Structures are given as C-alpha cells and as structure tokens.
Write a protein that binds this ligand. Structure first.
Ligand SMILES: *[C@](O)(CCCCCCc1ccccc1)c1ncc(-c2ccccn2)o1
Ligand SMILES: *[C@](O)(CCCCCCc1ccccc1)c1ncc(-c2ccccn2)o1
Ligand SMILES: [Cl-]
Lengths: 545, 546
C-alpha cells in the first residue's frame, strides 16, 4: 500500500507549487513599483554591509526582502531547493524590531526548523499535513532580532543523509552543476545560499549536515557545540539519542555572516526562552583577535582517502597560514576507526535502527538513501552473520554492520562512557601539543546525485567532530582544476571496498566545483573557531574581505 | 568468600588510624610552638573574614591550617567523618599561590574527589589499594586558587545512599546527636563542617547527596546545574548513565562561602583543564542583586508528607519573604510521582542495577543500604510479578520496583526523551507564573542511623531537581521544637507504606536539631539561586555573623 504516500506527495507538490506561485506574484508586484531598484547591487552586498544599510535606513526592509525573494524564486528553478514560502513573513517584515542585530535580513530555514502553520515533513509521508503549532525557539530569537524568515528549504528523506532528495518535494540539485548533489541534509540551504538566493540560513548537523552542503555548494557553515544553541522546537525523527548530539548552526556567504548570526542568537531572548542552553554570550574579543595560532593539521584521516582537490586545498591553506606566522603542527585524533565504527555508528543506531525505521512504515524509500533501510531492517543475527562473512575481505563494511545492531540499556551505558572517555582522550592529545585550533580536510567536491547514500565511509571527516562534540566549520578555499579531476583516475581508497569505488566515480567530472577545508576548536570555543575560519577566508579568498 | 573484603577493611582501617595519628602529631608539634594562638577566635571566624586576614597577612596559612587540622581531629572522635589525611598537603601549604582567591583556606573533600596517592574507595572493597594517579580537575583548581585540601571525608558504601556508613571506615554520625544520621552521601563533609572542623568542602549530589547532609547537620550546600562544574577525575561506580547527571558543589557554614567557592572554581583554570564545561564565569552582579523576587513555593510535594518542623520552617520563611517585599506564589511542579518513579528511578536504574551491582561482587553490603542490593538482584520477571502484587496495596513500592528493571537501548532513548520533555514542561509551568525562584521544603530533622536506607520515598524533595537538573541549595532556618516533635506522633504520611512508617519513627526524638528549606532556580542560574539563599539566610538567621 502506497496510496497514503502518493496522496502526501500530491499534496506536498501542490503546496510547494502554490508557495512558489505566491512568491512570483509578490515579486512581480514589488518590481512594478520599484522599476529603478539596482537589484544586483543589493544582492551582491555582503551581509554585514546589507545589515548596516538596513540599519541606517539607506535600504528599506521591503527592498531587501522582495529583491531576495525574487532571486530565491529564480534560483529555485534550476535547483528545487525551496519547499515552502513562510506565509506570515511579510507581516513580520512590517513589525521587525528596529534595533535588532538582524533587522530587515531575510533568513532561509532548513525544513526541520518548526514554523507555525507549516509542515516540517523531512520528506516523510507521516509528517505531511501535520503543521507545526508554534515557531521553534531559534526562529523566535531570529524574529526578535528583526530577521525575516521566508522559506523552508529541502532535505533528504528523514534528514539522515548527505544527499538531498525525498519522495514529497523531490530532488535538490547543486547550483554549480545539475548532475551533482548539493550535499546535505541541509542541501536546500546550500543550494539557495550558494546561488545568491538568501544571505543567511540555519541548518542542522549530526554527521556533517551543515558542512557537506556548505562545502559542496561553495559557502560557509558552522556546526557549534551541540548545546551552544537551542534545539527546542526542532523537528526530528529519532528522539532521546544523546550519545552523538545534534547541533544547529548558521550557513552564509562569508565568515562574518556566521559570526553576526551567532552574536544575534546568543542573546537574552534565547537564554530565557530556553534556560537549558548555557547563557554564554558571543565573545567578540576572542572572535576579533589577531594573535598567531597553534594550528594542528592532517592531510588525511587514513579512513577516507581525500580527493586530489581536497588534499591540495588542505596543503595550500596550511602553507598560507605558515606564511602568515601561524605554527602548523601535525595532529591526528587517535582511534578514528573506532570513533566512527563503534562510537558514532553505535550511538546513532544503538537500537538497531528500529525507532528510525518506524518513520518509513507505509512510505516510499527515496533512492538517495540507498540500502540504509534495507540494511537496518535485517534481523540482528543476520547483521551479525553478514558481518562475520564480510570481515576478512571488507572489514569496514563488517564493522558498520555489526555496530548497527540492537542492544540493552546496559550496553548503551557502556557506549556513552566510552564516548566521554574518547572525548577526554582527544582533549588530552590536544593539550599535550598545546593546539589552539585544528585544520582538517573537508569532503569535496560534490558527489553525483544518489551517491552519498552509497559512500557512507566519506562521513569520516565530519562525523568525528559530532562524536567528539567539538565546534567545526567549513570555508571554501579553492575550486577543482582539470589537473585535480584527471588525478581522480588514480584514486584507489584505503580499503578498496564498495564505498571507495563509489566515491571514486562520484567525485569525477567536477572541474570548477568548490572545495573547502574544515576548522575545529575545543568545546564551547565557537568564537575561536570562527576567528580561525576568518583567517582562512582571508588568506585563501582575499576578495571576500 | 569475604576474605578479600576483610583484607580491604583491615587495611583501610590501618590507613585511617595512621592518618589520624599523623594529624595528631602535626597538631601537637604546631601547638607546642604557638602556645598563645587564640584558636577559638580563628575557628569561629567566617570564611570571608578568614580569607581576608590570610590575604592581608594578619593570619599565617600555618596558623589557619594547623588550628583547623586540630579541630578536624577532635570532632572526628565523635563523628568518624575523616577517612584520610591528604599527605602532600603541608608542602602545598608552603607553595599555595598568594594571589589565589582561596589563599590559605583548608578545604575538606568528599572521598570521591580523586587526590594523587590516595584511594577513593567509596567504601567498596574493589577500590581499596587502588590509589588515584592524579588530582581531579576541581582539586587542581582549588590548589591553583591557593586552597589547601587536607582530608578525605566518609561516604556510604557506593555513595548511592543518604546515610553515611560503609564496611571499610564504618559509620559516620551526626555531630548534633550521635544516634542520628549525618545524612549523605556527603555525610563526612556534613559532619565535619557542621561541627566546625572545616570552613569549606566539596560534595556531590545525584539524588540529594549535598543537600541531605547539609540539611541534617545545620549547614549550607549548593547543587549546581550538573555541567556547571567539572566532573573530570571524580571517582564513581556507574559509568555512562547520563539521564540523571551527577553534580558537584560546595558545602559551608554560610551562603557567602558557597558564592566565593563557586567564584574561585569558575575561573580560566577550570575551563581550560576541562573544556567540556561551559566557560560561564560567576556573575557577581546577579549574585549581589537586591531586587524583589517572584518566589514560587509549596509546603508539601504531596509525595512525602513533611514533618511538622519542615512545614513550619517553610511557612515561616514564606512569611518573612512576604514581610520583606517578595511575592510568594503557590507553585508545584507537575507530575512529581512520574518524575520520581518513572524518570528518576528509571534513569538511575535503566539497566536493572546490573552495572551498579558489579561493585558489590565479593563485598559486604552495609546495613545502611537496606534491601536496595537484594531488590536490584531480583530477576526482571520477579520484580515485575512482585510489582503487580504490590500495586493495589502499595502503589508507590510497586512503581519503584517496576521502574528498577532492565530495558533496551530503544526504551532508554524513549526515557531520555521523556526526561528532556518533562524538563521543558516544568520550565513552561515556571515561565507561565513568571517565577524568578522556587522555595520548597527540605527533608528533616535528621533520621536515625540506618533508616535512610529504608525511607527511600523521602528523597522526593531533593531528587526532583536532579531529574530536572536545576540548581538547588539548602539553608538552615530553624531547629525542631518540643511542639514540633510531639506532633510527629500524629504523622501518618500519604501512603501508609513501610517508607512512611519508618520515617515517622526515624524522625523521632529530634528536639534541637536543625531544619532547612530548599532554594531552586532555573538551569545555569546558580548566582540567582545563591542570591535567594542569601535572602533566606538574612531573614531566618539574622544573628548569622558577617
Ligand atoms: C546530517 O548531519 C546527516 C549527514 C549524513 C550522516 C549519515 C551518517 C551515517 C553513519 C552510519 C551509518 C549510516 C549513516 C544530519 N543533520 C540532521 C540530522 C538528523 C538526523 C536524524 C534526526 C535528527 N537530525 O542528520
Ligand atoms: C546522592 O545524591 C545520593 C542520594 C541518595 C539517593 C537515592 C535515590 C534512590 C534510591 C533507591 C531507588 C531510587 C532512587 C549521591 N551523590 C553522588 C552519588 C553517586 C552514586 C553513585 C555513583 C556516583 N555518585 O549519589
Ligand atoms: Cl551543557
């Protein structure tokens, strides 16, 4: 029976179509009244300058809103990144608090950021036609800071994916190349911000879901420490999994934009609306520091062989940092295989997938999820026998499979404790070399559509820091050259298993696509992390001031 | 076989004896050289004044250290609160950083605060002769702030108890009345600080273990939000249970001492030594505020009927707050039975007790734990059958028994999510009435020895805030009167089960014993919480000296 799933799809498509139609009408009505508005001047302004002109009165909020609405609508045509037009938002426009740190700034939202009167489907049939009954906390704070949230953007079915397709709204494409994934689970945001259609957005990230789409689409993203920001009111599909913690964070065209966004969120409105978040205000002094940095670095995690473009990105950044006076120290977190295979996978799937799979009862399984659902459905004894068979030839596959089995509360306790010990073990490493920050590769360039679901190993660069729960952001530093792309033909991977084979093929045909590096700091050091991101932005892409 | 347990007891008792003997020799040697030191003047100084005089140079650190060491040794004689003399600590004395916020202050440590070269036994055989390899983080911070940690103090076997006895170092007694429990699991500290033998100490608290001993021994304690202070290096016996988190916090003779101790701990040293703790510095402006407060309150949680002393303590505090200009708003957190029976008990024993019971293999089970170990050992089906049998008669006993069973990772996720939602439910309730703070009763007067283990129900007043993970502190406000004590003979309890019956008997003969109220704020509001504790202290113990 798929009648219910087909009904949901038909309806979701109707709403998305209607929303885009409403956007078109609003944009045309505005343009007829403002024939002389220099829209490209306004669209190309960096957020900081846009904000200052909104604040001075030089730009009206309406001019900014409708110009950006027009561009969002245009870029959606080739990306399918927008799922819904947040229908209140013009009335919010007219009432945006004037002294707010984000006054007059349109902000895009990953679909799971609950918004009153709108579904947060996550691409699942069961969530369709169940509108949210209030704004989640961070949407409330944005609004109290004068921001104007205006679209929900697309995500892969269930959000447990670094691709971006679902059976409801379909497939989001990379704005730089249609055959490529925008990444995700925050892929809508990546596609939208990456093509100029929103100056600022929020995403979420449990295995790389802010960082993948940022990297793949050539923009900036920060995954803070999990509890730096509020997850109150967020839509999700598994509840009470605390071993590997969700984080929510900003995505934007530059580092300053992420900094401003954090500064606006980390205010009294957030702290009182959600007392469970520690009231740590944005430390501007740490963000603005120009002190030389002790920067740890690795060019590979020995788990996912990096692409030629990834490796060159890393070495060139290393080199410009050295040239600017920073100390670059080789550093690799210990026991990565164990963090990924036992701690991260086990933490994410301690119950064998059963809670997660309830979401798919009755539903279609998007092709971009691959065989994940098929695998999770297998009984525990079969996952185990399969694991023992695969171990000698494909130890990685064997490891994930074994750790995706159900267990007792007793074993989850043991797992939670190991996560905590691992965390302190890397902190210890870090302190022993006296690092300030850590520079790593970031998976790049964008994989072809429907391949992230088949290259699970490639999450190693990002998931490590979900497991450690350290702040981690990504900055675009280069684009893939023909030379980089030709060298993929020599890429073999460290394991030679199906994940390596698919990644080889998936990263081909990527000339001109953006490639990032990743910046990490210790827990609660989001300001230092951003300070480091700002430095990399400056040295590698000087033109983004 | 208890041959190993007996061996560990014999050794631990030798060490304790040797420790105390070393303390005596050091005290005697000092006193010989300082015949004209007014030790009572020095002992009776409040910590803030003591700190200032250490800081000016008017009192030497040696004077303060040895005078306090002498008092500790004296009060131990009738309390058995000291398990070990922290042997480095005279060398640390000589090297204590002069600009440190706690320069020259002797500090007592609950035995689970790891200290280089010493066991943290927790009263368990299996931890004896396994000396800690370094100081835990908060001990390091204390030392970097110029403090001088000097004794490990006693705890009930495993710490999972609000009495204070174990098979290794034995039973700690209340300094006010030796037939009474000092409370605990931080009972050593309560007994030591409560009789004058230490001006400041740190304890831990997962179900009330800072607040019970503070309340029972007539002193102050704060249980902060769990992750306000670093737990790195703390000794425990259950690993990876994150549903109901442990919290560490100060104990002292007044509120200002708690404030100073939090201020000294919340510095860059702690934050960089344990990056997992959010670097929230102590907000003095919030602590020193004298704004009128919206104070929620209840005289009873409808779970544990309060003793007459508890209820009067609560109403008199309510009344003085109103007299002082604060708004007192009736308020009771919703669904307390659920939070205690399902959320707290389940989170604490999600695995049916199996990890916890590992600690007791081969060991004696201290009488003061009651039947806890016997009940955890019971197979799951039998816990369940027993529970259905008890349900009609004793629903409370039935509930705990049912929620003490093992479950899957899947159900723990559901539970962890329920804890998180309940937390938000109470927060919403709290915001709906626009409270600043909450005033509740606090269990007591001190129960007789070996009865906390049989009055599990009486953790209701404190464990609620472990479950909610709100900062909660206790302040002494009155002592039990003849009239309060006479009225316990009419105490029936709300359930009439064996826990109500034992509490009635256990609080008997308590004239003169201290009785506290409890102060709560929202998560991360330790400064507001302490501000409110200060106000109750000012109104109810006006003769509490500066
Ligand atoms: C996003 O980070 C997910 C990226 C894809 C990670 C797949 C990891 C994996 C590991 C082992 C086996 C298979 C796959 C992301 N952002 C939000 C969420 C999310 C998911 C579910 C509930 C709430 N939030 O994932
Ligand atoms: C302390 O808070 C314990 C107070 C007693 C709580 C008993 C609650 C209970 C009993 C039976 C059934 C259900 C609930 C305290 N402080 C520290 C610790 C501790 C214990 C074990 C390991 C580490 N820390 O308990
Ligand atoms: Cl936290």
């Amino acid at each position: 029976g798929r009648q219910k799933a087909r009904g949901a799809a038909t309806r979701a498509r109707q709403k998305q179509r209607a929303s885009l139609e409403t956007m078109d009408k609003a944009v045309q009505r505005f343009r007829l009244q403002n024939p002389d508005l220099d829209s490209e001047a306004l669209l190309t302004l960096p957020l900081l300058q846009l904000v200052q002109k909104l604040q001075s009165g030089e730009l009206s909020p309406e001019a900014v809103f409708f110009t950006y609405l027009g561009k969002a609508w245009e870029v959606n045509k080739g990306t399918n990144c927008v799922t819904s037009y947040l229908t209140d938002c013009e009335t919010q426009l007219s009432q945006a608090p004037r002294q707010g740190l984000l006054y007059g700034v349109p902000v895009s939202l990953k679909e799971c950021f609950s918004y009153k009167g709108h579904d947060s489907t996550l691409g699942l049939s069961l969530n369709e036609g169940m509108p949210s009954e209030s704004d989640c906390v961070v949407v409330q704070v944005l609004k109290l800071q004068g921001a104007v949230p205006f679209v929900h953007t697309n995500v892969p079915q269930s959000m447990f994916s670094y691709d971006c397709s679902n059976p409801l709204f379909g497939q989001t494409m990379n704005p730089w190349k249609s055959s490529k994934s925008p990444g995700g689970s925050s892929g809508g945001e990546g596609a939208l911000i990456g093509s100029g259609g929103s100056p600022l957005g929020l995403g979420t990230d449990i295995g790389g879901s802010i960082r993948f789409p940022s990297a793949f689409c050539g923009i900036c993203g920060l995954k803070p420490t999990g509890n730096r920001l509020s997850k109150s009111g967020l839509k999700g599909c598994v509840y009470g999994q605390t071993a590997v913690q969700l984080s929510l964070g900003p995505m934007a065209r530059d580092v300053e934009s992420l900094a401003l966004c954090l500064k606006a969120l980390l205010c009294e409105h957030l702290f009182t609306l959600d007392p469970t978040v520690p009231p740590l205000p944005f430390r501007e002094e740490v963000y603005r520091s120009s002190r030389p940095l002790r920067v740890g670095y690795y060019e590979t995690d020995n788990y996912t062989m990096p692409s030629p473009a990834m490796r060159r990105a890393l070495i060139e950044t290393k080199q410009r940092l050295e040239a600017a006076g920073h100390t670059l120290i080789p550093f690799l977190p210990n026991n990565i295989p164990y963090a990924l295979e036992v701690l991260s996978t086990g933490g994410l799937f301690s119950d064998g997938g059963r809670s997660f799979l309830q979401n798919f009862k009755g539903d279609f399984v998007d092709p971009c999820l691959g065989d994940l659902i098929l695998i999770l459905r297998l009984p525990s004894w079969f996952k185990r026998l399969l694991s023992l068979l695969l171990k000698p030839l494909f130890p990685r596959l064997a490891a994930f499979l074994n750790n995706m089995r159900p267990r007792s509360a007793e074993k989850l306790w043991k797992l939670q404790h190991e996560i905590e010990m691992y965390r302190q073990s890397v902190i210890a490493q870090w302190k022993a070399m006296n690092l300030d920050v850590l520079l790593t590769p970031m998976l790049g360039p964008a994989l072809d559509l429907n391949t992230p679901g088949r290259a699970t190993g490639a999450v190693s660069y990002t998931m490590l820091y979900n497991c450690l729960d350290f702040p981690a952001g990504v900055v675009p530093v280069t684009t893939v050259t023909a030379e980089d792309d030709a060298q993929m033909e020599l890429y073999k991977g460290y394991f030679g298993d199906i994940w390596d084979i698919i990644l080889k093929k998936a990263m081909k045909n990527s000339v001109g696509l953006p490639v990032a590096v990743q910046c990490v700091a210790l827990p609660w050091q989001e300001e230092l992390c951003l300070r480091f991101m700002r430095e990399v932005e400056q040295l590698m892409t000087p033109q983004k001031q």
